[PDB]
Amino acid sequence: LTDQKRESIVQAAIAEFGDRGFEITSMDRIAARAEVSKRTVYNHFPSKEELFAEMLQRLWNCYRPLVSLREQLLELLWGKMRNLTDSSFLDLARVVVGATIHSPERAQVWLARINEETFSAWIRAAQKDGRLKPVDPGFAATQMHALLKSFAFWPQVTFNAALLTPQEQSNVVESALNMFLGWYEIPG
Amino acid sequence: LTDQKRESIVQAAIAEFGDRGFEITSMDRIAARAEVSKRTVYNHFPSKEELFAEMLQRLWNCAEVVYRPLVSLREQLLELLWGKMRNLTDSSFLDLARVVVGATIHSPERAQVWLEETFSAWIRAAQKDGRLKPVDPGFAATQMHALLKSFAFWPQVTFNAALLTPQEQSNVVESALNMFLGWYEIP
Incomplete structure (x- = not known):
């Protein structure tokens, strides 16, 4: 049993960083495709550093x-x-x-x-x-x-x-x- | 008036690419480091893809060996x-x-x-x-x-x-x- 909403955001992060590249990709662009609120994204990962850390x-x-x-x-x-x-x-x-x-x-x-x-x-x-x-x-x-x-x-x-x-x-x-x-x- | 120029722009691209990567390096960034116009670069390497080839x-x-x-x-x-x-x-x-x-x-x-x-x-x-x-x-x-x-x-x-x-x-x-x-x- 893992957290499926964390995975959702991680997944979108992979896809988006794959699409746009890492540094030009923003947390809201991620949120747009996780189909999630900018808010629930920052809850799990307060920054791209903390998200990169997890990856x-x-x-x-x-x-x-x-x-x-x-x-x-x-x-x-x-x-x-x-x-x-x-x-x-x-x-x-x-x-x-x-x-x-x-x-x-x-x-x-x-x-x-x-x-x-x-x-x-x-x-x-x-x-x-x-x-x-x-x-x-x-x-x-x-x-x-x-x-x-x-x-x-x-x-x-x-x-x-x-x-x-x-x-x-x-x-x-x-x-x-x-x-x-x-x-x-x-x-x- | 192009002997220097080609090599100079390949050297530019090698230095710039080597530093920040191929993708993020753009043509008139290479044109700048090579000190030539963007078109001057653009008629030597018609595309960024011709740069990658040259790379x-x-x-x-x-790269004996036999x-x-x-x-x-x-x-x-x-x-x-x-x-x-x-x-x-x-x-x-x-x-x-x-x-x-x-x-x-x-x-x-x-x-x-x-x-x-x-x-x-x-x-x-x-x-x-x-x-x-x-x-x-x-x-x-x-x-x-x-x-x-x-x-x-x-x-x-x-x-x-x-x-x-x-x-x-x-x-x-x-x-x-x-x-x-x-x-x-x-x-």
Whole structure:
């Protein structure tokens, strides 16, 4: 159960920022298409900053004893792939990237907020159990993420590429897995 | 009376685009930085879209590269990665790369028209030579780039993250190499 009127306003924000661009889009233009009163808009978000803050949070927001690393890591990779293959997520991603790319102040809120995650937590756990090779958990997670995002995120965000078909999806997951564990696994 | 002028207006546009982005930069803003009339710009680049095209040409101009059967895969592939990382760690290149990335997200219509190959041909040659497992070269090239771009392209271009340090640059190059050949190489 989430709040459907918040979502209404967020949705219109995405659409409008997608249409007009972020900085030229006003709270009343948003309200006009949320089909809401300027008033109920300010209640939820007192400013575009506070609204941008919420969109950001939403964005990059999306280890077991001995079941095989493979089995459990397959499952992780699928979780992240199912999230990437959501067009409402790609949309938000697009407007957020679009809003930060040529905006220094917005870049510095991105980058202060990307200094405080799942793949990382696991790699560190897998390492303590002596099943993965010593490396900075964050260094390893980035590669992990890159092996998926390079097919299922960036093309879509930058070029409006199609979603991956399921065949394509497991294809990319599978080689990511194979490549990743290939290099990092200490075999037990 | 136009030798200077073309280049001067392409330099203008590169500086202005690099600073505020492709979309928000308008023609007589470029005309101003280039110190020429708006029509003077408008008859060199008949449209803003001819600017974007030229922006690509430039980006491309920063890009051996042929496959050598007689030496290690690692030698030649370290060389490719490092050539690719040398552009990645070049601020002019990232700026130019940023305008281009920004211009296609901001425009569904030009992204749609405007879709690396160096690596994919090196891969298919290596596969012919029996040294890499069968894989779509395109797909494996994408993965190779992702291992560099994730550290040294996307952060910098989408949120002006700091360039990688020399140490960091040569760790992501080593690691990509190891990761890639670990899985793909037929030794």
